[PDB]
């Protein structure tokens, strides 16, 4: 996260750090929702580690659990459909994060969090950083990315005018969230891609969770 600040221990307890260098959110206590590009494909896999319960990755309080299976979005090919579920060997006993099933919240100011670089080509962070980034319409985002944007599957956020605050390398797979009408956190995006980090005219692109909600809920049931 570029232009970020330290999140407090316990602020976003649903966050997990994945061993390949991606963030994730606890969809279920033993199911991590992350990006498709963080994994190589679906199947049994006990090679991933999820670190949950701490803002400080070096914390002795860290909970580290191994995966058992991975379900990448069917047909992922690098264009859209940027989501995957990771089944854990054991539950991480922390609050989960609800996902958006409608588009009612795909607007306003979102919060992003991660242990990714705080600058282009910078290094991974020890402590979880957070930032607020505003929604950018598909049209304004398209004015920047052209045909690379899959409007129905992607939601943009950031400051088109000045840049300055954004997600960056290593933040991928992390949730982009905000409060719902019940003042509960709700997941509207997955960190997916962008050109550079925090540059004027290039907002961050995120998986538009509302589009894939049903697909995700169903896959989660079979895991
Ligand atoms: Ca969109």
Swiss-Prot record:
Pfam family, one: Trypsin
Protein name as catalogued: Trypsin
Residue span(s) of domain Peptidase S1: 1-221
Catalyzed reactions: Preferential cleavage: Arg-|-Xaa, Lys-|-Xaa
Family per similarity comment: Belongs to the peptidase S1 family.
Record's keyword terms, sorted: Disulfide bond, Hydrolase, Protease, Serine protease, Signal, Zymogen
Name of the encoding gene: sprT
SUPFAM superfamilies: Trypsin-like serine proteases
Organism: Streptomyces griseus
Domain of life, source organism: Bacteria
Record site: Required for specificity: 166
Enzyme kind, highest EC tier: hydrolase
């Amino acid at each position: 996260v570029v232009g970020g600040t330290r999140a407090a221990q316990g602020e976003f307890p649903f966050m997990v750090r994945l061993s390949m260098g991606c963030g994730g959110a606890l969809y279920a206590q033993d199911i991590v929702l992350t990006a498709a590009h963080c994994v190589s494909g679906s199947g049994n896999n006990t090679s991933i580690t999820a670190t949950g319960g701490v803002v400080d990755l070096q914390s002795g309080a860290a909970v580290k659990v191994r995966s058992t299976k991975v379900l990448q979005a069917p047909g992922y090919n690098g264009t859209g459909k940027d989501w995957a579920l990771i089944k854990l060997a054991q539950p991480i006993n922390q609050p989960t994060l609800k996902i958006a099933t409608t588009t009612a919240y795909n607007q306003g100011t979102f919060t992003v969090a991660g242990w990714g670089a705080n600058r282009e080509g910078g290094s991974q962070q020890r402590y979880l950083l957070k930032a607020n980034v505003p929604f950018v319409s598909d049209a304004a985002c398209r004015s920047a990315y052209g045909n690379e944007l899959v409007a129905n599957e992607e939601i943009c956020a950031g400051y088109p005018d000045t840049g300055g605050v954004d997600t960056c390398q290593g933040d991928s797979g992390g949730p982009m969230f905000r409060k719902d009408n019940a003042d509960e956190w709700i997941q509207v995006g997955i960190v997916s891609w962008g050109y550079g980090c925090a540059r004027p005219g290039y907002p961050g692109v995120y998986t538009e969770v509302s589009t894939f909600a049903s697909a995700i809920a169903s896959a989660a049931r079979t895991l």
